[PDB]
Design a protein around this ligand. Structure first.
Ligand SMILES: CCCCCCCC/C=C/CCCCCCCC(=O)OC[C@H](COP(=O)(O)OCCN)OC(=O)CCCCCCC/C=C/CCCCCCCC
Ligand SMILES: CCCCCCCC/C=C\CCCCCCCC(=O)OC[C@H](COP(=O)(O)OCCN)OC(=O)CCCCCCC/C=C/CCCCCCCC
Ligand SMILES: CCCCCCCC/C=C\CCCCCCCC(=O)OC[C@H](COP(=O)(O)OCCN)OC(=O)CCCCCCC/C=C\CCCCCCCC
Ligand SMILES: CCCCCCCC/C=C\CCCCCCCC(=O)OC[C@H](COP(=O)(O)OCCN)OC(=O)CCCCCCC/C=C\CCCCCCCC
Ligand SMILES: CCCCCCCC/C=C\CCCCCCCC(=O)OC[C@H](COP(=O)(O)OCCN)OC(=O)CCCCCCC/C=C\CCCCCCCC
Ligand SMILES: CCCCCCCC/C=C\CCCCCCCC(=O)OC[C@H](COP(=O)(O)OCCN)OC(=O)CCCCCCC/C=C\CCCCCCCC
Ligand SMILES: CCCCCCCC/C=C\CCCCCCCC(=O)OC[C@H](COP(=O)(O)OCCN)OC(=O)CCCCCCC/C=C\CCCCCCCC
Ligand SMILES: CCCCCCCC/C=C\CCCCCCCC(=O)OC[C@H](COP(=O)(O)OCCN)OC(=O)CCCCCCC/C=C\CCCCCCCC
Ligand SMILES: CCCCCCCC/C=C\CCCCCCCC(=O)OC[C@H](COP(=O)(O)OCCN)OC(=O)CCCCCCC/C=C\CCCCCCCC
Ligand SMILES: CCCCCCCC/C=C\CCCCCCCC(=O)OC[C@H](COP(=O)(O)OCCN)OC(=O)CCCCCCC/C=C\CCCCCCCC
Ligand SMILES: CCCCCCCC/C=C\CCCCCCCC(=O)OC[C@H](COP(=O)(O)OCCN)OC(=O)CCCCCCC/C=C\CCCCCCCC
Ligand SMILES: CCCCCCCC/C=C\CCCCCCCC(=O)OC[C@H](COP(=O)(O)OCCN)OC(=O)CCCCCCC/C=C\CCCCCCCC
Lengths: 146, 71, 268, 198, 159, 69
């Protein structure tokens, strides 16, 4: 009894969700695996910083910044980037799977912050040597002339 | 026998196959078969009939000075 | 994806996507209209359809997407261009000679002598190949293709106007029918349907045999506004008594379209 | 300047030439009446058909780059407008269609005439009419095309500001389009009674 | 030589044949140079858009093929002894396609120059230029149609 | 590669169109020899066009092996 929606648009319904705070994080993964639901913005008057999950989002926003820094140094060199299984999560057919933990995500934070402190130093210990180099080649090239 | 009745006799044959296909169109994607075929046969008819009617009683006849006498 | 560029449809209205599957490539083939150039399009797309599994996996450019995203649009612009070219009878600027011709030349002539052909029958499917190479060939085709174009847009427009009705009857908006639909229908059908009925009627009359003179339709359409009750050449009996009525009917439908719906708002 | 100097050096030769002929008793020699009579009415009729579809295409092509160059600039930040503001490119193209309907009507009136009846009352009448009717339709659609482009370059900028304002400026863009439709009417009335060359 | 066949009569054909390729060439040059300078400005930073932005340079090249098609058809209707009816037909045909393509050409340049610069900054703005630019290439065509209607009547029933 | 596909599809239909043309000159079809400005001798032109098609046929089979490998 599934409808066809080509002569006219498909019929829709508005639904309400009573989610406990314990399983809010877990339910949201499953709703995204479907790809069927379009959420309204109930908190439409609240300013952008007065919203409640803003602090959780900055921890993850900072991480994406730290990854953009990495992809830049790579492209600065001739390295190619590994490409993994784009289908290991899903095949786009609405299948279920279990999401990560909260501790795994907290490990990406300290790891990514820990890598930024090393690479930022290893790059400056490299560049300062190359400055000493270019200065001497110019001092060397000039001497070759008669 | 070529006449305006000849256009009607096609329109009867064509206005009936549209009806039979309406009945017999399969259930899967029923609207695409049903609209596309009925709407295709119609614009195939209108462009035939226009091209036929412009020739029954024409008001100017073809004229040239370029043929060979042998023909 | 073509209609969605122009706009996203209202909830539960007629989609503009079903008619567009046929009317988009058929209007193309009226213009394009050739069996050679159409057979080439048909192959160029039929390579994209058969190798779609290979192509979809591999990575694509930006031009090669749209040629692939519309690989079925191009298939139907090719098939229909082989139908329309067959009727126009044009294959790489040349003609086919399938059937007997409805025209006949003199039994005898000489070099350089302008010769005219005499009628025998009607050609069944398409334009007769006697016109090819002829001196007066455009005078025939230009008159033919104009009257094709006017008739094929009147049908395309009216059919899309009966989708307004199909919506009003689904949302139960009765006033818009009496307010918008029925007056606007009479406006254009009485003017541009009368034109289209007269083109089909003039083609269906043997004017020379009957002895009466064929009338011009551009002047007949102008003078009915400028000078009603007047005729120079008659197309059918009681022509003037019907023209002035159609003028009367169109002028009534203007204020009825203008006033009827706001008054219902005020009266509620 | 130079270009304006020549405009004043032409005016000064037309005057000194007119007074040479007049004071000498030869002012009849400058006769516009014979020129209108002896010139061929096919000249006047084939200029008008050309200056109708030519001057109408100048106007249409004009408004398309005023409306087109602003939309593309406005469309950088508001790319959603290029299909909503498309209606302004449509009212600018359509004045060219009006100049092509005339040339269909007038081309029918081009027929060959005998040499004895060439400079007759009716065949001179028919050359004068298709000249000024073509001027009329062409020079009037030239004006309706430039105007609608100006109107429709603003409606692109207003729509990028706010979607609501687009509708309000269309009313100005419709009234401008009436100018081309009136010109078509006036031309058909001129050439209504004109008859094909005998 | 005759009241209907003077000796200055071919002047309007030869001048009409010439003015069809002169006026359409000028248009397709304004629209090639103008457009062509935007392509040489965006593809210093975005060389990946080069082959996609030559589309204005194509549209103007078609304006020139129209004027060539009218010069080829009126040329074979010329003769030492032709009527004055025929000559002014040959004129209006060239003055129509020429004046129409000149105008279309300039618009192709002004609009094509802006599109190539914008679409580099907004890739959704390419299709918007391809639309606007077809309504210019079709005005060179509307002049071609007039030239063809008239040429048919050129040597019809002449004596 | 594309340097070879070009003359493969090009010379594919040169074999086809030029052969259909030559067939018609040979049989003296009205549309090809009917007017006076058309050539006077039908088969003479076909003899010249049968050979021209063979030249495209060689380019076809050659480039077929080139792309096939
Ligand atoms: C000082 C010289 C150096 C500079 C040269 C630059 C060009 C100067 C202008 C040249 C044209 C004007 C001089 C020639 C006019 C006289 C020709 C002539 O005798 O023709 C007569 C004859 C009529 O003879 P009858 O009716 O029997 O009457 C008896 C004769 N009176 O009429 C004609 O042949 C008229 C022909 C005139 C053509 C003039 C125009 C030539 C073309 C110039 C085009 C310039 C504009 C650019 C066009 C761009 C688009 C294609
Ligand atoms: C001018 C002379 C050269 C001409 C060269 C032509 C080359 C062939 C080009 C392809 C033509 C056939 C395909 C067009 C029909 C299908 C278009 C279509 O489906 O568009 C969808 C698309 C929406 O989705 P996307 O933006 O594709 O993103 C989601 C995709 N899943 O639709 C729209 O944007 C709406 C407008 C549709 C019509 C647009 C047509 C534009 C054609 C431009 C041709 C450009 C040619 C460039 C040539 C450069 C050569 C080096
Ligand atoms: C675009 C295609 C339009 C034409 C095809 C339409 C098909 C549907 C026809 C329904 C028409 C109903 C009303 C008219 C019935 C006419 C009955 C009939 O057979 O009349 C014949 C008779 C001719 O007889 P003869 O002269 O002997 O024929 C030639 C002899 N050698 O017809 C006439 O005289 C005139 C017929 C007028 C037809 C008008 C049809 C109007 C259609 C309008 C369509 C508008 C949009 C396009
Ligand atoms: C000359 C022009 C000839 C072409 C005219 C063709 C018009 C055809 C219009 C058909 C429109 C259509 O499909 O309407 C569908 C729609 C159904 O909508 P749903 O929402 O699916 O209904 C839900 C409950 N079952 O039908 C209707 O309700 C309206 C039916 C209209 C029938 C029209 C019949 C033909 C009239 C011809 C008039 C010609 C001019 C005088
Ligand atoms: C399908 C829709 C058709 C709607 C139009 C109906 C037109 C009827 C034409 C018709 O039958 O006229 C025939 C008859 C001639 O018949 P005979 O040649 O004597 O032969 C009779 C024996 N065979 O016609 C006449 O007498 C003169 C012509 C009458 C034309 C009347 C025009 C009416 C205009 C109406 C305007 C509204 C048009 C709406 C169009 C809707 C299209 C779906
Ligand atoms: C006998 C026939 C004589 C015909 C003379 C034609 C004169 C043309 C005048 C004209 O348009 O000049 C060009 C005009 C002058 O502008 P100003 O700024 O006033 O210049 C002076 C500044 N101090 O400039 C322009 O139009 C743009 C530049 C290109 C002009 C090209 C002119 C070509 C003239 C060819 C004449 C051939 C006659 C035969
Ligand atoms: C039939 C053909 C009829 C041809 C008519 C041609 C009319 C031309 C009108 C020119 C008007 C014009 O430009 O006027 C310029 C000028 C005013 O200049 P200002 O603005 O005061 O300069 C200082 C500005 N800071 O006024 C004049 O030139 C007046 C004299 C014009 C006489 C006519 C010129 C004819 C030129 C040759 C035509 C062939
Ligand atoms: C170049 C001529 C410019 C105008 C001055 C004309 C002088 C002149 O010819 O006067 C005599 C001439 C009679 O000549 P004819 O013997 O009939 O024929 C021969 C003509 N050359 O007189 C006239 O026709 C009168 C003409 C008057 C026109 C107005 C003259 C105004 C001159 C002002 C010049 C000021 C300095 C610059
Ligand atoms: C301007 C160019 C056209 C001028 C045409 C002048 C000649 C003309 O057509 O005259 C016609 C006719 C005379 O006919 P005739 O037969 O010669 O004499 C009467 C015999 N019973 O003219 C008149 O009726 C008078 C018209 C006079 C117009 C003025 C002269 C033309 C030039 C403009 C002069 C402007 C004033 C100049 C003042 C200069 C002061 C520094
Ligand atoms: C290379 C390019 C060359 C380009 C050349 C440009 C030329 C521009 C046009 C020049 C036209 C000059 C015409 C007048 C010349 C002249 O002096 O004529 C005098 C001559 C008298 O000669 P006589 O030998 O004295 O006669 C003795 C009789 N027993 O005058 C006459 O005969 C009358 C001639 C009248 C001509 C008037 C022509 C006016 C045409 C204007 C255009 C038409 C109206 C257009 C309206 C457009 C509205 C938007
Ligand atoms: C400031 C000062 C202003 C001074 C203005 C002076 C104007 C002088 C005009 C002179 C006119 C002279 C007319 C004349 O005599 O010409 C001859 C001739 C009469 O000859 P007959 O006497 O019959 O010959 C007998 C032979 N045996 O005149 C006529 O027939 C015509 C009279 C009218 C002249 C018209 C002049 C040209 C007008 C062009 C108008 C164009 C309008 C353009 C509108 C554009 C709209 C967008
Ligand atoms: C989309 C573009 C459409 C126009 C393309 C060009 C086509 C030209 C011919 C079309 C038919 C005539 C219609 C009227 C066109 C008027 C065009 C116009 O305004 O020209 C302006 C243009 C000046 O532009 P500028 O102000 O220097 O540059 C812009 C500054 N922001 O005008 C000129 O150059 C005037 C030239 C006058 C020369 C007169 C000489 C006549 C000689 C006759 C023989 C003696």
């Amino acid at each position: 009894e599934k409808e066809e929606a080509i002569f006219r648009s498909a019929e829709m319904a508005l639904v309400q969700f009573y989610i406990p705070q314990e399983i809010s994080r877990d339910s949201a993964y499953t709703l995204g695996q479907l790809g069927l639901v379009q959420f309204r913005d109930l908190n439409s008057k609240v300013r952008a910083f007065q919203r409640t999950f803003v602090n959780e989002i900055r921890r993850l926003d900072n991480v994406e910044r730290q990854y953009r820094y990495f992809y830049s140094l790579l492209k600065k060199h001739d390295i190619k980037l590994y490409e993994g299984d784009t289908d290991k999560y899903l095949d786009g057919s609405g299948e279920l799977y279990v999401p990560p933990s909260g501790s795994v995500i907290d490990d990406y934070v300290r790891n990514a912050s820990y890598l930024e402190e090393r690479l930022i130093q290893m790059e400056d210990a490299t560049d300062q040597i190359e400055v000493q180099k270019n200065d001497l080649e110019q001092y060397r090239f000039i001497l070759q002339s008669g | 026998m070529s006449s305006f009745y000849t256009v009607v006799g096609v329109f009867i044959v064509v206005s009936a196959m549209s009806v039979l296909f309406w009945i017999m169109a399969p259930k899967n994607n029923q609207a695409v078969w049903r609209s596309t075929v009925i709407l295709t046969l119609a614009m195939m008819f209108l462009m035939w009939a226009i091209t036929f009617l412009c020739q029954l009683h024409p008001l100017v006849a073809p004229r040239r000075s370029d043929l060979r006498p042998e023909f | 994806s073509i209609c969605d560029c122009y706009g996203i449809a209202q909830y539960r209205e007629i989609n503009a996507g079903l008619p567009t599957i046929v009317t988009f490539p058929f209007m193309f083939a009226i213009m394009f209209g050739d069996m050679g150039h159409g057979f080439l399009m048909t192959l160029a797309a039929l390579s994209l359809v058969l190798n779609e599994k290979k192509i979809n996996k591999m990575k694509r450019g930006e031009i090669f997407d749209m040629a692939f995203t519309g690989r079925y649009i191009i298939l139907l612009m090719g098939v229909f261009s082989m139908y329309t070219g067959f009727l126009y009878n044009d294959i790489f600027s040349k003609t086919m000679t399938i059937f007997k011709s409805g025209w006949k030349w003199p039994d005898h002539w000489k070099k350089g002598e302008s010769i005219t052909a005499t009628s025998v029958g009607t050609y069944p499917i398409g334009l007769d190949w006697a016109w090819h190479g002829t001196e007066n060939a455009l005078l025939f085709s230009n008159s033919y293709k104009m009257k094709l174009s006017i008739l094929m847009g009147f049908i395309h427009m009216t059919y899309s106007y009966f989708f307004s009705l199909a919506n009003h009857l689904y949302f139960n908006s009765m006033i818009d029918i009496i307010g918008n639909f029925i007056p606007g229908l009479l406006f254009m059908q009485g003017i541009f349907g009368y034109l289209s009925v007269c083109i089909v009627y003039k083609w269906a009359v043997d004017w020379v045999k009957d002895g009466k003179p064929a009338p011009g339709l551009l002047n007949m359409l102008i003078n009915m506004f400028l000078s009603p009750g007047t005729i120079d050449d008659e197309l059918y009996p009681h022509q003037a008594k019907v023209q002035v009525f159609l003028l009367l009917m169109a002028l009534v439908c203007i204020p009825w379209l203008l006033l009827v719906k706001p008054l219902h708002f005020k009266f509620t | 300047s130079f270009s304006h100097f020549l405009y004043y050096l032409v005016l000064i030769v037309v005057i000194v030439y007119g007074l040479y002929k007049l004071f000498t008793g030869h002012g009849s020699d400058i006769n516009f009446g014979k020129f209108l009579l002896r010139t061929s009415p096919y000249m006047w009729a084939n200029l008008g058909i050309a200056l109708c579809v030519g001057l109408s295409v100048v106007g249409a092509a004009w408004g398309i780059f005023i409306t087109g160059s602003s939309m593309i600039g406005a469309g950088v930040r508001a790319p959603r407008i290029t299909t909503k503001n498309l209606i302004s490119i449509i009212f600018c193209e359509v004045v060219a269609i009006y100049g092509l309907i005339i040339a269909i009507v007038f081309s029918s009136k081009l027929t060959v005439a005998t040499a004895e009846n060439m400079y007759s009352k009716s065949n001179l009448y028919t050359g004068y009419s298709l000249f000024w009717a073509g001027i009329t339709v062409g020079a009037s659609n030239l004006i309706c095309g430039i105007a609608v482009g100006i109107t429709g370059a603003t409606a692109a900028i207003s729509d990028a500001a706010d979607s609501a304002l687009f509708v309000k400026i269309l009313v100005i863009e419709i009234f401008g389009s009436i100018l081309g439709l009136l010109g078509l009417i006036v031309g058909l009335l001129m050439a209504g009674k004109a008859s094909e060359f005998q | 030589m005759t009241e209907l066949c003077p000796v200055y009569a071919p002047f309007f054909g030869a001048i009409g044949c010439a003015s069809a390729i002169i006026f359409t060439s000028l248009g397709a040059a304004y629209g090639t140079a103008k457009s062509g300078v935007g392509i040489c400005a965006t593809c210093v930073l975005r060389p990946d858009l080069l082959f996609k932005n030559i589309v204005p340079v194509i549209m103007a090249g078609i304006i020139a093929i129209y004027g060539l098609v009218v010069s080829v058809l009126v040329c074979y209707s010329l003769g030492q002894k032709q009527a004055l009816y025929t000559g002014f037909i040959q004129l209006g045909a060239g003055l129509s396609v020429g004046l129409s393509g000149l105008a279309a050409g300039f618009a192709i340049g002004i609009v094509g120059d802006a599109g190539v610069r914008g679409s580099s900054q907004q890739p959704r703005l390419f299709v918007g230029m391809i639309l606007i630019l077809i309504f210019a290439e079709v005005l060179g065509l509307y002049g071609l149609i007039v030239a063809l209607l008239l040429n048919s009547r050129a040597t019809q029933d002449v004596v | 590669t594309g340097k070879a596909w070009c003359c493969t599809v090009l010379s594919a239909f040169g074999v086809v169109i030029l052969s259909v043309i030559a067939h018609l000159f040979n049989t003296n079809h009205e549309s090809f020899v009917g007017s006076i400005n058309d050539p006077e001798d039908g088969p003479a032109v076909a003899h010249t066009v049968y050979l021209a098609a063979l030249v495209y046929l060689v380019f076809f089979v050659f480039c077929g092996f080139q792309v096939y490998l």
